[PDB]
Amino acid sequence: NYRIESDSFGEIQIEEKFYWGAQTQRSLNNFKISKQKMPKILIRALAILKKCAAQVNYEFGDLEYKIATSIDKAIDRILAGEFEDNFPLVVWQTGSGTQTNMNMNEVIASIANEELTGKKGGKFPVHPNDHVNKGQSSNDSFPTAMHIATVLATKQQLIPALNNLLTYLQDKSKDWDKIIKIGRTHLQDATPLTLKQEFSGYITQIEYALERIEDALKKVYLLAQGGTAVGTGINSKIGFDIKFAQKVAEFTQQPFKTAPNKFESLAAHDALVEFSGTLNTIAVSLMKIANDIRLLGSGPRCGLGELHLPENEPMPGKVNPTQVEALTMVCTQVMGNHVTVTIAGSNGHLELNVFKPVIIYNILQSIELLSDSVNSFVTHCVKGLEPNIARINTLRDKSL
Amino acid sequence: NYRIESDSFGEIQIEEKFYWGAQTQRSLNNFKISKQKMPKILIRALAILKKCAAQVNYEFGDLEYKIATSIDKAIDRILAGEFEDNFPLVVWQTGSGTQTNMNMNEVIASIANEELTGKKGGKFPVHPNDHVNKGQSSNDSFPTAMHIATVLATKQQLIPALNNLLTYLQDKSKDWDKIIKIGRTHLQDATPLTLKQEFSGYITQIEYALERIEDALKKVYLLAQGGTAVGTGINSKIGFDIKFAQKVAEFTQQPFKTAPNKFESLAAHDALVEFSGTLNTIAVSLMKIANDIRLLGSGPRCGLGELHLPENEPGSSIMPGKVNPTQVEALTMVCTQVMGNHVTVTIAGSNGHLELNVFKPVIIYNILQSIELLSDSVNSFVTHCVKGLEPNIARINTLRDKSLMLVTVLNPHIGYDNAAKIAKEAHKYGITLKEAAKKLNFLSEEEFDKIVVPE
Amino acid sequence: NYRIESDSFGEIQIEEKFYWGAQTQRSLNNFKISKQKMPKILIRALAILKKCAAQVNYEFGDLEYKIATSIDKAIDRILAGEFEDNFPLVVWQTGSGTQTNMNMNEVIASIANEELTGKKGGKFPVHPNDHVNKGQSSNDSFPTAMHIATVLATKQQLIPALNNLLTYLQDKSKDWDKIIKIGRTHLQDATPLTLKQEFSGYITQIEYALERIEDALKKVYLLAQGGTAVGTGINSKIGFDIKFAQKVAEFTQQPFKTAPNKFESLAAHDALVEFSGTLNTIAVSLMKIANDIRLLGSGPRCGLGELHLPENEPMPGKVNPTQVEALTMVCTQVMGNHVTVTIAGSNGHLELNVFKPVIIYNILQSIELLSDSVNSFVTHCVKGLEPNIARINTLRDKSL
Amino acid sequence: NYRIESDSFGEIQIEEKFYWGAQTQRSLNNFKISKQKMPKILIRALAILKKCAAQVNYEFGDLEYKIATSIDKAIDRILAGEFEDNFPLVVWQTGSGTQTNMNMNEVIASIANEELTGKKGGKFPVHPNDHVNKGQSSNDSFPTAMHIATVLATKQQLIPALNNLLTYLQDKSKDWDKIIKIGRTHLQDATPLTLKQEFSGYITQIEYALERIEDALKKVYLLAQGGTAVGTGINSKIGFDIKFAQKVAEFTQQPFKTAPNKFESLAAHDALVEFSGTLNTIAVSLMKIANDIRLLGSGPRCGLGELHLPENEPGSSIMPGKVNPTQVEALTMVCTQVMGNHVTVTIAGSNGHLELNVFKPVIIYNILQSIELLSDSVNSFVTHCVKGLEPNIARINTLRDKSLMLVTVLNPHIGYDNAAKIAKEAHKYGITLKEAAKKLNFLSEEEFDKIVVPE
Ligand code: NA
Ligand code: NA
């Protein structure tokens, strides 16, 4: 039931049914720190990275045809979800992500070797380092995967989620221009505005959130691949950085390019600190929008009672704004995640920032929580918001 | 493969092999927000809570023998680990934890009903709300679970890990009193201290971490159970609060009591915000300790090189033979996670409204994560780094003698003027202070090392 | 109009009317970073430190009688507020506080020299380093002053302020047990509780805040003095640490003692990070209390309207809960101050944490803002809170 | 020595030499909360605001010639710096900034009334609310001032300081291309890079800081003025908003416009929260740069020793001759202050209620402080550290040759096996790779240095 693998530290046992190699197993044994594995979309991004690197390596004459093709077939299968069991390493590993890099290197080599020899594992004929990792360091590969992942998640999770919110905020309030409600400043009675007008503030906040995302992504399109170990490009052929980036742009259909200065790309993660800053602003916007709805839906008899919130689950008969609670909790999570990203980003030393996994784990969590909670909020709260017109009219007609 | 269940809102389908009910399945369908489930030890805390509440209810005559005994047996199976598949709800739910409370209520009833009738699910003979949740709200139950879980995790994970680090810091540095290294202030050359003395700082930081936890636990021992919906204790018999706390104290063997003021326990989580603050401080201490070990072991040739860190894996694919301080990296990364987790807890804690703070799941999720991560990573750091740390004594000595600031250790022993002559001679010929001491016939190489000792 | 002073870097000009010396002026010229000077109470604490050190030095036989007496007279005058013009250095200086240490050393020497020779300044007969700073480093003196200051401010500003709040929360609500109001969970109508009961939550929060302060001060009583440059005590006579601490305990009438491990005292500021943690919890408590009052006083016609807040200043006739706004802003300040203290505390290197001035500036600001805002809040809001009983009764009698 | 004034609440005394009125003195007596006054540049912004609002009002025919001209002349004297004593109110006031708005309204009226009548104070001929505050609320005025001040400070303090740092990073490192130092990853010995290349990272961080500011300013150019109380623009004539923005654009020479949606501008300060986020990133960049320079200049003998930092003062009283990297300490301390200031702004920004975010003073206070501190400290760091940085070239070379990881730079030039023999020889005899290269007749001391160059 076991296979033996090795590296420069010696022999090590791996359970036969798993495709990973000596360094993954070594990491798996030595870092028994909680159960948070690397996010699926990061693994996906890392797989895309190896795919594109292999193609460039092949085109440069540096890989045998059968090895390049076997690596490519092997990676296509990972992208289809066939080896989700085979990336067991935790986030809390080496700060450069070396081990997760080797996790991808070894699994690809292993699948390819099973195709070519009939048996998985090992370094023949496909070597994890000399073929799958050819011309790469973890120091430039892991940041490249961090940026690919961030872009993919933002374009697939967050931007649609915000557009879903924008659309329903627009559609619901289109005809609330006839509803004249009483404004509150300091929570004290103020002068009148329409309910549509009040909701137009929220619409502006979300529109502006979408604009901030576009500006924050500009540096996240820029990829470190080609800097190798310390930023100089040692062991990377001239042109690799540019051709790799074009390859990733073509597969993702996103405008990726190479980072003009690779030293800045390795030594720091300022792009992601800035990006996390935009996530934080979005958290602030949503906290305000959700809090107002909580407040306007308070009651039914001893609150404000201007809005009726959909009732989705069960002091019997009492129904709570549960979606607002889920969303406002996520907002507080994102704000704390941002402080972690800040502090980790500030702790770079010379040629390398070695806080990379904690940074990307927090970025990707914030994107996913914001997207999922907003979509839930729209479906189970915003879509069925109705104003209580008689209540709004009574409140207005009492104002001094 | 499906069973039908019902609540106030109507009919709903549950996959047959699972034990939860209608309200849990409803929540499962309505809060599809990522993948972060309630932590194992919080579910455990909540089960313990229900076991004790059912026994007190039974003592008050408010549960029949058949029902109280089956509830108790069902809960023991959950505490045995037999139903870890049956708590699927995410953290990002209602802010009171109602759905997770009800998840526990339904699963207990369901296990009991299978035992009594042969078929799982439903509300007869055992009813989730009327029996399992009798005399309880989620408003007082969930805060009770939060504190039980915090105490359990702190005592089972955190205190043992810090003591593990303490013991090995003490053991490893016992005989480092004769290793005389150079002090660095502002990262600039300073005067000497023993390697042991430098480690004594770290030891003190961990001893103080342990004291801080004991003070931080004081209010976490106090339980909300009995406040019910708003804190008034309506639908709760006089004495239930005290008798429930006693039971939990017996089962856990921890000094749990009831909170004097139930309103404070529902409306806020200041106790967990204070506790998070202590976790924050521990993160700050560990960051300093781990950073020093990394800095002291930097090299092997182009850095400081005073400590040899155990080499556990290959550090690089391009540069073979390179070994990195990977355990320090995992620990310092965790430290940054705890610092951020603390801000989340702070902000959530500050957003209470009137009778209830409804940010409860996110608060307890961060507290428990911070505890697990500090504990797991400290344990790993000890096993794979502290255990095998060795000083590079020859390198430590070389560096000590390079310091020009040794002059001020020489002043009281050799005289102010004479030390000045040595330091002048060392600048002119470009030699060490030791070599200049021997050159001018003031002090041998052995007499020089004795004066330099801290004393 | 100028006097010339010097140090090992050479000669430097000081305006004649000022008492400080070469190193203070040098710092004053080289760190032109905003206008935040060291807090008054820190300077005060540093002056107390030099007073007690001199007395111990004198008792050990290490100072001439006339110098010890002149130093003591000189310091008594600083404590009386006579040289508030003479500590111009900014917080954003060397991270060990050396320059502010020399600021105190030089000014004391200067005043003493004016007494003894008729002219201020210089190092004769009282030398800033060899007499006023005898047996001291900035590395152990500045942490000692940080802890003295924190204790003094907490005992003189914060503890009385919280007791003032506790007392008035108690007195105002004593007879609110007859007022039956409707409870709100999730801001939805709930079951009843008395107004006194609701206020008893707030009373508990403040009581518990007072208990947390006592626990957090335990390590802040422990003083670094005697560790000198790197923690070893080089150039400090045996017994100095203990006798100094007793001297400070006697002058302040507070239970100060020496730090058992001086290395921990220099290398880190974990005591203050923990203390700042308690300030943060207090900020959280007060934010809740103040927010509820904002909410319960909302109206007069379109809010909850359960409480009447005092009207202290001027949509004419509209009066806002201005004291609650001041207080809740301070709370957000304290929470951010706490993150600065955290991050700075985490950045220690080997024998010394060199973020000391930013840490103490934030600690002392949080104490002063919390105290002043709470006292203001009590005087201009809590003292005159009255319930609107008819409104409370109407709301209750509408509950489902 | 006193003058009497009045408002809705009654009679109140003001010291005679000051120009403020009844509402300012009331606020002065009721908010005795520490000492933190409104920043100079925010007061200036608010004056500019009133100058432009009065001119637009006059153009609409809603101020008489006498009154508009005297208002304009009074404001110019405030912008000249003639009344810096007359704005005593603390930051910790009402959350809308009403009292500071009224401080400006009263002082302008008072200066104008002295000019027109000979006696300062009061509300005739110039009335604080009816003339100086005409068509304005504090709800739209204070946010307008916040953005004007942020733009002014960013353009006058921050952008110049970052450009100053940029210019000197470029100038100092121009000819450091021939200095070949060793790279460190995980603080472990790695492969070489030029000193210039290492500095190129820092240069990139600052160039990107400047781009980030330009994007962050986009929404700060947009002004609330015209929304009045709740955002509807009641008591504001159509066109006032556009014409006010134009005037401010003319006076400042900055591209200010009116905010399309006034409700968003009153109810929140997301734009300043986003801007704070950019300041945060700049703090993170500077922390890395300053920390590296400190680490590279550590020593002078027992650390890294690659850079010589200019020595500006004595570092110690016990250890004479010790010099500390004091400018790096002041800058990194400021960085921690900005990071905390950002959390305050984030939390304050998140506590808006309906039509108004009433945490405005604390938000703008932190933003402006962060800008001033980053600017002042970067400027000082350049003058007193970056300007005079020199590499210690002999030390840089020594360290480079100690690296065992040079082997991988030798592989493509000398062959894999041959480099292995050199590294084996270097381990056996305990020498450098260069000495072992010459020993085995593979490579001279000059040919070795050429292969090592990054290329
Ligand atoms: Na987090
Ligand atoms: Na601050």
Side-chain angles (χ1 to χ4, degrees), chain C residues 332-338 340 361-362 365-366, chain D residues 336-342 344 365-366 369-370:
Chain C
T332 62
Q333 184 79 358
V334 172
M335 296 171 191
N337 288 4
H338 175 68
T340 291
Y361 169 70
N362 278 268
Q365 188 186 76
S366 291
Chain D
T336 68
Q337 179 82 4
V338 173
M339 293 169 190
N341 292 3
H342 177 67
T344 289
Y365 170 71
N366 280 270
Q369 180 185 96
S370 286

Side-chain angles (χ1 to χ4, degrees), chain B residues 419-427 430 432-434:
Chain B
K421 292 187 188 286
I422 294 167
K424 190 193 175 194
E425 185 77 351
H427 269 82
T432 55
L433 286 172
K434 177 182 279 170

